[PDB]
Symmetry: C3
Subunit: 176 residues, 3 copies
């Protein structure tokens, strides 16, 4: 009964987090020319996005990670002539699934930048208008820098149970 | 007629400010370990919220204040494990009314922080979709720091006719 | 056929940029007491706005410029007593058209400031709800300072094909 009630209560949050009331989160990792990882996090209800400008301090590559509640088909990205520029690309196809014990812990899109990048990304939850408007207002933004990837892995990634893929293609995350 | 027209024209803005065309405002006061008060203000139409990160410069407590146009039932707050975190609490019950001459001048929710806090709050007006979207774009954000509460009271609170509750539980504001 | 296909393919973007899928852009130029021009740009789908605070470094005047996709009637502005303040003015009437070869390249509203200004502006495109919400998340914000107007004209304005009006009332932009 300590394992029955423990596991009959563990699945009372995967069928909740995946149920609109569940948040949807995104991380944008900017990997820098000195190996330091800067990470913007945003968590929100209904939909979530990030819009930041990444410049010297020089940025080399990008990883964007969604919680498994996102509708991968809904992801869009806007990278920065105005008269002939499209407002975004639907890059969901380019996201690789991050698995732990055969469970999706997140989705990772990784790409390098040619040797200052401006970046926006948006995704919607898997699935009244005033509720969504409030959700924009309640989205919480966390922004941190880490000197080396291991430092981010050891103190940002592993303590917080966050889905990740480090530089040797090791998947971090927690199966539920 | 100088008092008739003066008071028959004074109520031609309480039945307007409370009529959607009326703004709805929020103040988040962060009270700091050296007694200084930092204040974020935001005013907007239809709905209004604040999302800021409060860190050292160390923050000790918080007061959030709504203009009387908010629907107190609509207020939500998001304070900052991701897999089991709710996106907000409905904290309207916890707001005390701020009265002046028996009139509600605002609503105040005060709480202390355990001895860096991240904070979002949202509220909706008392009571087409493109109008609300524009309203997000037109929300104006004012951010100030004050060395002591009296300095905030004397130069931020009393000059601007803003509803407030200082540390001795004195209510500031203007009846209309 | 090098001019037929060249010009039968040139109009396959003015009837696109003006078709919702087309972005809508705004620039807010803050002209400073030392003649330096600071410029905030934002581009987006469906609707676009800017909300910035302009202070010393002192700001003297403002020019706001819309791409020709905006509905000029939709423009609103919010400049910063709370109990009697309107949330915005509909300033579309005050915008002058910027023409190049008899074609509208943008709309310019210019005004001076009395001798720290807070400013928001919003406009909608000329002409499902989740698409607009994502569009807020995907709006890209560019912010630059230039030491003199000529420097902005020469390196920000002329290279990027941006509609502009400099201080001698010369219209910059590209006809399409």
């Amino acid at each position: 009964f300590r394992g029955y009630i423990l596991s009959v209560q563990a699945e009372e949050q995967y069928n909740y987090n995946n149920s609109l009331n569940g948040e949807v989160s995104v991380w944008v990792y900017a990997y820098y020319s000195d190996g330091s990882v800067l990470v913007i996090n945003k968590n929100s209800q209904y939909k979530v996005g990030i819009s930041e400008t990444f410049k010297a301090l020089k940025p080399r590559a990008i990883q964007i990670i969604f919680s498994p509640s996102v509708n991968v088909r809904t992801i869009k990205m806007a990278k920065g002539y105005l008269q002939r520029s499209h407002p975004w690309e639907a890059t969901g196809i380019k996201y690789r699934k991050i698995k732990r014990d055969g469970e999706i812990v997140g989705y990772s899109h990784y790409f390098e930048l040619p040797h200052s990048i401006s970046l926006a990304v948006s995704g919607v939850h898997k699935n009244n208008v005033m509720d969504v408007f409030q959700s924009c207002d309640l989205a919480l933004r966390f922004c941190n820098r880490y000197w080396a990837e291991l430092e981010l892995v050891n103190h940002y990634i592993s303590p917080n149970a966050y889905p990740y893929l480090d530089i040797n293609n090791h998947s971090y995350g927690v199966a539920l």
